[PDB]
Design a binder for this molecule. Sequence first.
Ligand SMILES: NS(=O)(=O)c1nc2ccccc2[nH]1
Length: 167
Amino acid sequence: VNSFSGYLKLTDNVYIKNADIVEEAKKVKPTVVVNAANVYLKHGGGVAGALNKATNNAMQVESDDYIATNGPLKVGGSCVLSGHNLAKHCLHVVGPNVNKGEDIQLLKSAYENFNQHEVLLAPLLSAGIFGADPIHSLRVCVDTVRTNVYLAVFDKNLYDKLVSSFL
Ligand SMILES: NS(=O)(=O)c1nc2ccccc2[nH]1
């Protein structure tokens, strides 16, 4: 038993809620929140911009030190950094950005990072401003992630479509 409230159960291990991931993290303070990162950990917009703004830019300061030391992530890759005021840890995951020509086949690799953590609060990877079909992203999530994932979907209209079309 955990702190997540009001999620709809999709599968044995996947749960979903219409919620702003920024607000959900501040309330729950989960062990792991997933960020929809890019390879530079430049948290300008989307989920990453919103999470970073909620940390008062501390997430960006930590991220720039990480890149200065380690270089960019891979598309499909991840790193674990502080969760600041939002979570114990932030798992920064790079889904493919369709708008940049990145291979959508890398979405499954991206979601495999989630399997290194027992429970996560997460957005749909490659959704929103990363340009992928969210219905596809939820299908890959369900077919790839075996640990317990609590999905926050910001858009109420998209949430309803995701639930109503879910096989
Ligand atoms: N209401 S917000 O914190 O400014 C915000 N922006 C967001 C973009 C993508 C996903 C969740 C978001 N939340």
